[PDB]
């Protein structure tokens, strides 16, 4: 719960991601728009709870100082290795710790935002450590999070 100077400035930039009309205040409406752009669907009550948690003076909106104060409370991060492994596991059809290079290309070129076949080339080159056309995704994720 103590922030540096550069971080205070960087978080002013961050405030503009939320303060969509730039009026110096973040409202439930602006948080709804932002959360939906991130593919989530908070209810009105959830938006209100998210404002209220950091709404120090109770005027119904979050100011930069309320926003900054709050970030100081939550600076701690943790590694994402297991969550990332679990995302790969979604595509492990046989539950055997492997996804084939062919199946990985198929996933990456069809689902989500997608990679180009050239970008997939590079990914598989790194992922297929043994050159056996199979991705041990636990090992690949360990490599990327090291």
């Amino acid at each position: 719960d103590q922030l540096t100077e550069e971080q205070i400035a960087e978080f002013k930039e961050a405030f503009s991601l939320f303060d969509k009309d730039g009026d110096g205040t973040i409202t439930t409406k602006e948080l709804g728009t932002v959360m939906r752009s991130l593919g989530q669907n908070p209810t009105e009550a959830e938006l209100q709870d998210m404002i209220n948690e950091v709404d120090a003076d109770g005027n119904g909106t979050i100011d930069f100082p309320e926003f900054l104060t709050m970030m100081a409370r939550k600076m701690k991060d943790t590694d994402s290795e297991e969550e990332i492994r679990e995302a790969f596991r979604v595509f492990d059809k046989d539950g055997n710790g492997y996804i084939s290079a062919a199946e990985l290309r198929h996933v990456m070129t069809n689902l989500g935002e997608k990679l180009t076949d050239e970008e997939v080339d590079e990914m598989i080159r790194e992922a297929d450590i043994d050159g056996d056309g199979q991705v041990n995704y636990e090992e690949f994720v360990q490599m990327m999070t090291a």
Partner: protein
């Protein structure tokens, strides 16, 4: 930089739901215990009644707990987004 790391995890409306549901867990835990262990003669209609009330209260507290986990991750989404500006 932060690379692939993310914010580490772990209201008045919810607070009222918690106190009422928790009080009811205490209530029905006691009444089930009484009616199954401190009586000469178990009345099964009584036990069934308090079992229904017990499961409703336990599942109400679960619901609040799940909503708090949800709220916490919604807040952490926003904090994570803010932290992209640290890059």
């Amino acid at each position: 930089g932060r690379k692939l790391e993310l914010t580490k995890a772990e209201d008045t409306q919810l607070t009222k739901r918690v106190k009422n549901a928790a009080a009811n867990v205490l209530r029905e835990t006691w009444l089930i215990y009484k009616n199954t262990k401190l009586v000469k003669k178990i009345d099964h209609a009584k036990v069934r009644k308090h079992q229904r009330k017990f499961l409703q209260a336990i599942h109400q507290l679960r619901s609040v707990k799940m909503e708090q986990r949800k709220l916490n991750d919604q807040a952490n989404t926003l904090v994570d987004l803010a932290k992209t500006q640290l890059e």
